[PDB]
Structure 1
């Protein structure tokens, strides 16, 4: 679950299972030796303190998989990214998905 992208290029992260029903995806990041934080707090809504560079897919998809698109990779993106699905089909899942570690050369 390791993704290698050169700086300044585009990156795609795939997380979650097939889209049986609707989702409200929450994106989290883990820093080595530092407390986590938040990036996206809804399907597409974002909090303050971050520009509109980050993008995500809406929750009105059926049969697809949640994906994250990152462009213009910088040195500050070297962190482990985690996805948290919120499906109306299955109960609330308390275990996060396969964390993808982003490494920049």
Structure 2
């Protein structure tokens, strides 16, 4: 299978700062099937980025991203307190799904 690994596993950042979260695939993947999600405890995962780009409807627009092959990144242009969250990348291979690593962001 194709395993996604994100980094850093945990991180402490201040509001007002730029932040990035990486997602590396063990095998190359189509950018068109990659997505990023945000999660708060007790909530269903929220989609932010799909197709390794393409900001999701209703998104804050502070989020953007890009990538290809085995290397993808989620960028937050400025962190707001509401952006401190668990974030993960997933691959929707449609016959295979890959999940794991929440790069947990705290103040």
User: Which TM-score band (shorter chain)?
Assistant: 0.7 to 0.9
Which blocks of at least 5 consecutive residues in structure 1 are unaligned?
Answer: none
TM alignment of 1:1-105, pairs within 5 A: 1-18=9-26, 20-24=28-32, 25-58=34-67, 61-62=68-69, 64-86=70-92, 92-104=95-107
Q: Per residue, is there more strand in 1 or in 2?
A: 2
- Give the paired residue count: 98
Q: Output the CA distance in 2 between the equivalents of 1:93 and 1:5.
A: 33
Structure 1 length-normalised TM: 0.74
| Structure 1 residue ranges, 4+ long, deviating more than 6 angstroms after superposition | none
Deviation at 1:20, TM superposition (A): 2.7
Deviation at 1:9, TM superposition (A): 0.6
Deviation at 1:31, TM superposition (A): 0.9
Q: Which has the larger radius of gyration?
A: 1
